Scaffold this motif. Structure first.
Motif, mmCIF file in Angstrom:
data_model
loop_
_atom_site.group_PDB
_atom_site.id
_atom_site.type_symbol
_atom_site.label_atom_id
_atom_site.label_comp_id
_atom_site.label_asym_id
_atom_site.label_seq_id
_atom_site.Cartn_x
_atom_site.Cartn_y
_atom_site.Cartn_z
ATOM 1 N N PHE A 276 0.737 -1.153 0.004
ATOM 2 C CA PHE A 276 -0.127 0.052 -0.050
ATOM 3 C C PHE A 276 0.844 1.291 -0.073
ATOM 4 C CE2 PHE A 276 -3.812 -2.537 2.114
ATOM 5 C CZ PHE A 276 -4.210 -2.709 1.041
ATOM 6 N N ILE A 277 0.438 2.284 -0.838
ATOM 7 C CA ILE A 277 1.292 3.620 -0.823
ATOM 8 C C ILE A 277 1.271 4.294 0.547
ATOM 9 C CG2 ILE A 277 1.467 5.629 -2.059
ATOM 10 C CD1 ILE A 277 0.079 4.278 -4.630
ATOM 11 N N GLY A 278 2.221 4.586 1.024
ATOM 12 C CA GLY A 278 2.530 5.317 2.298
ATOM 13 C C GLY A 278 2.930 6.613 2.008
ATOM 14 N N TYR A 279 3.480 7.353 3.001
ATOM 15 C CA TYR A 279 3.922 8.816 2.740
ATOM 16 C C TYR A 279 5.223 8.985 1.658
ATOM 17 C CZ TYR A 279 0.742 10.193 6.568
ATOM 18 O OH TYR A 279 -0.502 10.349 7.423
ATOM 19 N N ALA B 208 8.419 4.195 12.721
ATOM 20 C CA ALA B 208 8.986 4.339 11.349
ATOM 21 C C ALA B 208 9.190 5.827 11.140
ATOM 22 C CB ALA B 208 7.804 3.952 10.336
ATOM 23 N N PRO B 209 10.130 5.994 10.160
ATOM 24 C CA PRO B 209 10.548 7.257 9.725
ATOM 25 C C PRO B 209 9.571 8.231 9.373
ATOM 26 C CG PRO B 209 12.100 6.042 8.995
ATOM 27 C CD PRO B 209 11.000 4.885 9.501
ATOM 28 N N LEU C 157 6.008 7.608 9.532
ATOM 29 C CA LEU C 157 4.766 7.615 10.397
ATOM 30 C C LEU C 157 4.935 8.527 11.418
ATOM 31 C CD1 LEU C 157 4.105 3.743 10.587
ATOM 32 C CD2 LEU C 157 2.950 5.331 9.188
ATOM 33 N N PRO C 158 4.165 9.545 11.391
ATOM 34 C CA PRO C 158 4.312 10.641 12.493
ATOM 35 C C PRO C 158 3.519 10.172 13.830
ATOM 36 C CG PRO C 158 3.250 11.641 10.836
ATOM 37 C CD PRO C 158 3.175 9.926 10.547
ATOM 38 N N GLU C 159 4.007 10.989 14.948
ATOM 39 C CA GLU C 159 3.272 10.675 16.246
ATOM 40 C C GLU C 159 1.880 10.858 16.190
ATOM 41 O OE1 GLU C 159 1.981 12.565 19.097
ATOM 42 O OE2 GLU C 159 1.930 10.784 20.333
ATOM 43 N N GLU C 160 1.329 12.017 15.719
ATOM 44 C CA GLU C 160 -0.352 11.825 15.609
ATOM 45 C C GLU C 160 -0.793 10.785 14.859
ATOM 46 O OE1 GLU C 160 -2.164 14.227 17.128
ATOM 47 O OE2 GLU C 160 -0.434 15.338 17.804
ATOM 48 N N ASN C 161 -0.375 10.147 13.837
ATOM 49 C CA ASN C 161 -0.813 9.259 12.920
ATOM 50 C C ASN C 161 -0.124 8.119 13.245
ATOM 51 O OD1 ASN C 161 -3.059 10.563 11.641
ATOM 52 N ND2 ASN C 161 -1.620 11.630 10.212
ATOM 53 N N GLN C 162 -0.383 7.483 14.277
ATOM 54 C CA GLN C 162 0.524 6.243 14.678
ATOM 55 C C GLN C 162 -0.610 5.088 15.048
ATOM 56 O OE1 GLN C 162 3.280 6.924 17.854
ATOM 57 N NE2 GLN C 162 4.332 5.084 17.476
ATOM 58 N N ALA C 163 -0.004 3.865 15.206
ATOM 59 C CA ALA C 163 -0.890 2.663 15.271
ATOM 60 C C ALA C 163 -0.354 2.174 16.804
ATOM 61 C CB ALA C 163 -0.525 1.477 14.166
ATOM 62 N N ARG C 164 -1.324 2.159 17.612
ATOM 63 C CA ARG C 164 -1.121 1.753 19.085
ATOM 64 C C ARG C 164 -2.326 0.961 19.587
ATOM 65 N NH1 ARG C 164 -0.258 6.909 22.867
ATOM 66 N NH2 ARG C 164 -0.799 5.143 24.443
ATOM 67 N N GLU C 165 -1.989 -0.392 20.152
ATOM 68 C CA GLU C 165 -2.915 -1.396 20.558
ATOM 69 C C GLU C 165 -2.834 -1.559 21.996
ATOM 70 O OE1 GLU C 165 -5.947 -1.993 19.445
ATOM 71 O OE2 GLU C 165 -5.675 -0.446 17.728
ATOM 72 N N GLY C 166 -3.398 -1.304 22.915
ATOM 73 C CA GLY C 166 -3.206 -1.690 24.424
ATOM 74 C C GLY C 166 -3.774 -2.810 24.800
ATOM 75 N N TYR C 167 -3.307 -3.797 25.605
ATOM 76 C CA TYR C 167 -3.650 -5.091 25.925
ATOM 77 C C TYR C 167 -3.446 -5.260 27.523
ATOM 78 C CZ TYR C 167 -4.658 -5.979 20.953
ATOM 79 O OH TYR C 167 -5.207 -5.744 19.765
ATOM 80 N N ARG C 168 -4.016 -6.219 28.057
ATOM 81 C CA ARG C 168 -3.679 -6.674 29.376
ATOM 82 C C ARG C 168 -3.746 -8.212 29.703
ATOM 83 N NH1 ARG C 168 -7.262 -4.568 34.763
ATOM 84 N NH2 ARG C 168 -5.773 -5.315 36.302
ATOM 85 N N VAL D 207 2.433 -7.358 7.174
ATOM 86 C CA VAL D 207 3.367 -6.643 6.885
ATOM 87 C C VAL D 207 4.639 -6.969 7.518
ATOM 88 C CG1 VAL D 207 3.940 -4.064 6.717
ATOM 89 C CG2 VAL D 207 1.524 -4.993 6.721
ATOM 90 N N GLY D 208 5.846 -6.451 6.667
ATOM 91 C CA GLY D 208 7.114 -6.971 7.028
ATOM 92 C C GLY D 208 7.995 -5.721 7.066
ATOM 93 N N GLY D 209 9.142 -5.674 7.922
ATOM 94 C CA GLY D 209 10.147 -4.746 7.823
ATOM 95 C C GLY D 209 9.734 -3.323 8.486
ATOM 96 N N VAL D 210 8.728 -3.592 9.382
ATOM 97 C CA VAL D 210 8.461 -2.195 10.410
ATOM 98 C C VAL D 210 8.569 -2.410 11.731
ATOM 99 C CG1 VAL D 210 6.258 -1.172 10.972
ATOM 100 C CG2 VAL D 210 6.095 -2.023 8.639
ATOM 101 N N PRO D 211 9.631 -1.609 12.044
ATOM 102 C CA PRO D 211 10.159 -1.627 13.554
ATOM 103 C C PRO D 211 8.985 -1.121 14.435
ATOM 104 C CG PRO D 211 11.701 -0.402 12.182
ATOM 105 C CD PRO D 211 10.374 -0.436 11.269
#
Lengths: 1223, 48
Positions: free
Chosen positions: A216-219, A418-419, A421-432, A362-366
């Motif tokens: 998929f096309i990114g920034y 990722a270089p 991906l900004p901080e506002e647009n980021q992927a975060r998922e919390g779990y317990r 997806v691969g290669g994403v820190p």
């Protein structure tokens, strides 16, 4: 203790091993377990027995089966199971849910793409839970993509591979995604579903694969996005050179197929060595065509079209991509094979996976995570973060975190780094993750399958640790490995003080190849009460076949010559049945890649696992429910919460010993043939690896042969010959066409069939091609064979091609259809129907009208209930109430005659029938005693005349009319008396024997009662004056029932009008108003009734409910009648009725009509469709099991007449007319 | 579905299954001419 371990959901017709364990004692006592149904008291499916001794250490397991012993029919067929244990020291019972979900269905089709008028070769693989063949009958149904069923077929399975007859495509196919379902047709579950699309697979010239550099096309790919377009032939060779045209576009959703597009390119690139790549910037596209240039504005798919044409010869192939949407939010994260639970003191691995927008890893994403290790009692501290990258081959990121022994829960927030991906647009998922206890005891098994996945035959060691037990001295170790929801083996070990952790060795078997689970539980002896601790972790291993089936051809070569005789050798470990299928590699249309025939034998087999997740969890109950088990112990409980060559070929099934070899001939085709085989044996199912059989030729010719060529117009007929020899040569190609096609040679040379093209030998370079075209115009309907002779050096060969044409105009019109009514349920009787054959004036010359006929089997009525009892024993024989006593006997006899059920009593039906006839004669004498000299009917000595009792007796006499006899002259004058005296000129009716609107309400009530009586007594005495009275009364009722007065009056008027004309406008308005005034309970409504009083011996609504039930039964609506039947079967009546028997006889008549209408829907129709002046075309035999019909084509032009015999049921026939009309 | 003029849909139910066809008849006094069948499309629309 007496810990019993059993699977959560049992399987019918399966060997379910039930294990039992004892805490241990010096005496060896036996145990017994049984399988009982819902009756406790009194039924038993099977009874197993075990033996306990010191050698077995007081544990044993016995297999149990669930056979079709369930009660036939009923409101619920399962009544899942009651499980009991018979032991000397303990005895307990518990219910457990079961399911008929047993076995698997693998539908294997020869081709994913079908053309009209083509055979359908398909086979179904029947299996059990133990991977056995499980020979069982199976039915196969077909569903049109529009949602309608097509045809059903049943066949018994003797070998294990269910062979089905070749299906035929109807004359008027429906393009789209079809549906195939299979069922065992008697009593089973696990219906299988297969898909296949009907399209035009005439010829794919070369496969065009679109593999972009990024999914998929990114920034970073917004300013510059490079995509690779590679086109390769089907015989494993790349395309030398071809012109590639690229087309871009923007789509809002995947459902919308048509969208605006540039209009800017139209980029022309050249294919080199079978691979091409071009750079496309999104800025120009978003600035020019999108009408707004910003990546934040456009969140929608990006459609790209690719058209590849060969520069050396006329050919065209197209490919496409669904879309690439510019999403502000990054790709989403999820956890796989990662238990969301905690083990104190032991390092807990964390395996997270990153997937794209549409179901792809997806691969290669820190990625990195933040964790907080909290203490059980007091404040916490922040754990050091860790960052890692995800591999492209593995697809899952690996993390490991060590936590202290005093931690209860943990929370981790995995975010992407990722270089671009900004901080506002980021992927975060919390779990317990919650750790495991009242006795503070724990249990753990290690290595989390990170071996990675193991093979079969090698022994594995697993470390267990009873951290902080109730007592240092542990009796024994107990562990159970399960797979497919069954216990394959039960383990046991001893605990010594040599070390704190012991390693257990578990042998792996062949039956555990798809997946497995293991649980380790140990029991302790408490001073007051006991408490056991368990734990489980997923088991992932490799996939190795038990049969070890491999297919290999005896000749070993990279390329095979066309027509070369080849031999195929099968090699198996044990005796097994093979199912060979030689599917072409070119049959795979674009069709979003046309993924694979099956590609999944173990992945679809994994669905047998009852529990979900990897393993581990809360207290023993929750973790056993998550693992798919239910335990029974004293300590804790469990809460439920023609040539050449058409495809495909080689559709055979043969027996295969350890080494079997067969001989056949390879077909003539340039594409590579992909052979595939499946093995069925006692060990299990195994699919062989697809072996590509390459059929290659040095010099061959191939052409476009377009599809659906419109007759009357010429075609280009572009084609090229391939030259793969190193040295050059000169070619000569001539064409020969059968009669009749206009040719541009004028004349042929030399023979009449052989047509010389006056070929000029043209040079062809090495690894090159030359263009050859022919101008032809078809004159007749297909198909016609056209010959193409190629005279060239290094041998010559002739190829034959088939050409099919289609008329200019196409117009489909059903134009006809009727529902055959055997007994005349709806309206008049309809059994024979003639469909005339007409020819429109717009018919194209030399066109034959085609018609297709089929039946559907609309529906079958429900068998909810038919209940009537205790009337003959209570009130059969036991001053003015003699009528009230003898009247219900007539209706009881009528119900008994309609239902045809007399075997309920031990006495002979003939004696009971004679006694009922004698009682009916006594009742006739009694009703004759109530007849006055004026022919009227009175209650008390005939002092006053009453119309209500007169109409009641008329109803009774009309009921009697159907069985023995009644004098007509005594009824005709009796009706004439009422028509003359008690009939108002307006249509109302009144009685002599004795709130302004209450008078009108009573008048309408009496009018409806008299209408019912006269309609019941009219069938035996037809008169013009009685018909006039009925018309006047119906007009009165239709005029005066406009306002909503009372539910009872509305219902009685609706019934009085339904006894006559049932399709009147005002009658339908009254029926709609009564349905609006109906009372329901539940969604969907289980009970339906009517209440007279609004917002109100006390049950007075039963009368209006019975009247509305009779009205609905007059309309023949089973779905609307069933809830009223449920209501009148059991409710708050208790009962609960008036007069009586004003409502009792009405309810009896309603039940009688319900039973009669249920008997009406039997579907015993025998359809024999024939022509008027010619022989019969086809004959349909309709039954309850086979409620569908096969489409039959109508070719011969003649009047078609569909008819049937007597029959019983209701079915509709559909016939459409497909005629080509110009246009 | 919304019936044509004169309505008179038989076996009236709340929801029809996909692929099931219901025959419509003309209200008195009228007569059915042509093709009188309503088949449920995959989507919420009707063939009409």
């Amino acid at each position: 203790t007496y810990v019993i371990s059993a699977p959560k959901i049992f399987r019918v017709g399966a060997s379910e091993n039930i294990v039992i364990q004892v805490y241990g004692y010096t005496e060896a006592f036996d145990a017994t377990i049984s399988i009982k149904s819902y009756p406790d008291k009194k039924f038993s499916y099977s009874s197993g027995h075990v033996h306990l001794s010191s050698e077995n250490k007081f544990q044993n397991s016995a297999i149990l089966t669930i056979q079709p012993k369930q009660l036939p029919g009923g409101q619920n067929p399962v009544s899942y199971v009651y499980l009991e244990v018979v032991s000397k020291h303990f005895s307990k019972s518990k219910r457990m849910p079961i399911t008929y979900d047993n076995g698997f269905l693998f539908i294997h089709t020869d081709k994913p793409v079908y053309t009209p008028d083509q055979s359908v070769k398909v086979r179904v693989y029947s299996l059990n839970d133990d991977l056995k063949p499980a020979k069982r009958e199976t039915v196969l149904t077909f569903i049109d993509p529009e949602g309608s069923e097509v045809d059903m077929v049943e066949e018994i399975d003797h070998i294990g591979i269910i062979s089905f007859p070749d299906f035929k495509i109807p004359s008027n196919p429906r393009y789209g995604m079809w549906t195939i379902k299979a069922k065992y047709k008697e009593d089973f579950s696990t219906t299988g579903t297969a898909y296949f699309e009907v399209k035009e697979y005439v010829l794919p010239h070369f496969s065009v694969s679109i593999e972009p550099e990024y999914n998929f096309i990114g920034y970073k790919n917004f300013k510059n996005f490079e995509i690779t377009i590679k086109a390769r032939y089907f015989y494993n060779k790349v395309v030398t050179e071809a012109d590639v045209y690229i087309t871009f576009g923007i789509r809002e959703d995947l459902k919308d197929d048509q969208k605006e597009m540039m209009q800017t390119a139209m980029q022309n690139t050249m294919l080199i060595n079978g691979i091409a790549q071009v750079t496309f910037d999104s800025e120009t596209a978003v600035k020019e065509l999108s009408y707004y240039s910003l990546e934040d504005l456009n969140n929608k798919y990006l459609y790209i079209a690719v058209t590849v044409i060969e520069s050396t010869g006329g050919f065209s192939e197209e490919a496409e991509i669904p879309g690439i949407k510019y999403v502000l939010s990054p790709y989403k994260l999820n956890l796989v094979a990662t238990p969301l639970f905690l083990k104190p003191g032991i390092p807990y691995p964390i395996k997270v996976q990153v997937k794209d927008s549409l179901d792809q890893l997806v691969g290669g994403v820190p990625v990195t995570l933040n964790a907080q290790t909290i203490d059980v009692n007091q404040e916490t501290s922040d754990l050091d973060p860790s960052k890692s990258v995800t591999r492209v081959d593995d697809g899952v990121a690996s993390f490991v975190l060590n936590l202290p022994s005093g931690v209860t829960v943990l929370e981790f927030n995995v975010k992407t780094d990722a270089p671009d991906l900004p901080e506002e647009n980021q992927a975060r998922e919390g779990y317990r993750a919650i750790a495991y206890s009242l006795s503070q005891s724990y249990l753990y098994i290690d290595w989390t399958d990170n071996h990675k996945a193991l093979l079969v035959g090698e022994h594995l060691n697993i470390i267990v640790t009873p951290k902080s037990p109730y007592i240092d001295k542990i009796t024994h170790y107990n562990y159970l490995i399960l797979s497919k929801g069954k216990i394959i083996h039960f383990g046991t070990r001893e605990k010594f003080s040599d070390a704190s952790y012991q390693s257990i060795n578990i042998p792996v078997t062949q039956n555990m190849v798809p997946s497995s689970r293991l649980l380790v539980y140990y029991i302790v002896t408490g001073e007051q009460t006991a408490e056991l601790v368990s734990d489980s972790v997923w088991l992932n291993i490799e996939e190795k076949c038990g049969n070890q089936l491999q297919v290999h051809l005896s000749p070993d070569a990279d390329a095979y010559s066309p027509g070369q005789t080849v031999s195929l050798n099968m090699a198996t470990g044990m005796d097994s049945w093979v199912a060979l299928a030689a599917v072409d590699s070119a049959v795979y249309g674009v069709q979003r890649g046309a993924k694979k025939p099956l590609e999944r034998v173990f992945q679809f087999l994994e669905k047998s696992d009852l529990g979900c997740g990897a393993g581990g969890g809360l207290n023993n109950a929750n973790v056993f429910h998550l693992a798919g088990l239910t335990f029974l112990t004293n300590a804790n409980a469990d809460d439920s919460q023609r040539s050449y060559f058409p495809e495909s070929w080689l559709w055979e099934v043969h027996l295969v010993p350890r080494r079997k070899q067969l001989q056949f001939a390879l077909p003539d085709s340039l594409t590579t043939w992909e052979i595939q085989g499946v093995g069925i044996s006692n060990t299990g199912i195994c699919v062989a690896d697809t072996v590509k059989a390459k059929v290659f030729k040095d010099v061959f010719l191939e052409m476009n042969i377009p599809y659906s060529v419109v007759r009357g117009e010429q075609i280009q007929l572009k084609g090229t010959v391939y030259n793969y020899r190193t040295s050059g040569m000169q070619f000569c190609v001539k064409m020969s066409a059968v009669e009749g096609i206009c040719t541009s040679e004028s004349p042929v040379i030399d023979h009449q069939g052989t047509k010389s093209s006056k070929c000029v030998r043209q040079k062809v370079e090495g690894s090159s091609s030359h263009l050859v075209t022919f101008t032809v115009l078809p004159l007749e309907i297909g198909l016609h064979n056209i010959n193409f002779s190629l005279e060239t050096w290094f041998g010559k060969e002739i190829l034959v091609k088939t050409l099919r044409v289609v008329p200019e105009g196409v117009k489909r019109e059903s134009y006809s259809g009727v529902t055959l009514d055997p007994r005349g349920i709806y309206g008049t009787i309809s059994r024979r129907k003639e469909f005339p054959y007409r020819i429109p004036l717009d018919l194209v010359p030399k066109t034959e009208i085609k018609r297709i006929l089929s039946v559907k089997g609309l529906l079958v009525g429900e068998i909810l209930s038919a209940v009537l009892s205790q009337e003959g024993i209570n009130i059969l024989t036991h001053a003015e109430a003699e009528l009230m006593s003898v009247v219900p006997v007539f209706y009881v006899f009528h119900y008994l005659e309609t239902g045809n059920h007399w075997n309920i009593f031990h006495s002979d039906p003939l004696i009971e029938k004679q006694k009922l006839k004698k009682k009916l004669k006594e009742g006739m004498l009694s009703i004759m005693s109530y007849r006055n000299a004026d022919y009227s009917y009175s209650v008390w000595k005939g002092g006053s005349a009453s119309t209500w009792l007169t109409a009641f007796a008329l109803r009774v006499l009309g009921q009697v009319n159907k069985y023995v006899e009644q004098n007509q002259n005594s009824i005709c004058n009796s009706l004439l008396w009422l028509v003359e005296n008690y009939q108002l000129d307006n249509g109302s009716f009144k009685e002599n024997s004795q709130l302004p609107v209450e008078a009108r309400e009573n008048s309408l009530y009496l009018t409806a009662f008299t209408v019912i009586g006269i309609r019941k007594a009219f069938d035996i005495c037809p008169l013009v004056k009685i018909d006039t009275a009925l018309i006047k009364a119906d007009n009165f009722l239709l005029e005066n029932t406009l306002p909503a007065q009372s539910t009872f009056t509305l219902a009685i008027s609706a019934y009085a009008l339904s006894l006559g004309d049932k399709t009147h406008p005002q009658f339908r308005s009254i029926v709609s108003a009564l349905k609006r005034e109906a009372l329901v309970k539940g969604n969907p409504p289980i009970y339906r009734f009517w209440k007279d009083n609004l917002q109100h011996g006390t049950a007075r609504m039963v009368e209006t409910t019975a009247y509305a039930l009779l009205t609905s039964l007059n309309l023949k609506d089973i779905n609307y009648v069933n809830p009223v039947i449920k209501w009148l079967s059991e409710e708050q009546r208790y009962g609960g009725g008036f007069y009586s028997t004003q409502d009792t006889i009405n309810a009896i008549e309603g039940l009688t009509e319900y039973s009669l209408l249920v008997k009406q829907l039997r579907l015993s129709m025998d359809i024999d469709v024939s022509y008027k002046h010619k022989g019969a075309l086809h004959n349909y035999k309709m039954t309850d099991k086979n409620f569908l019909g096969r489409p039959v084509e109508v070719l011969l032009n003649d009047d078609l007449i569909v008819s049937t015999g007597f029959g019983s049921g209701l079915a509709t026939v559909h016939v459409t007319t497909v005629v080509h009309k110009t246009s | 579905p919304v019936p044509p003029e004169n309505g008179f849909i038989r076996n009236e139910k709340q929801l029809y299954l996909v692929g099931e066809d219901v025959e419509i008849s003309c209200l008195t006094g009228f007569e059915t001419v042509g093709y009188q069948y309503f088949r449920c499309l995959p989507d919420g629309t009707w063939r009409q």
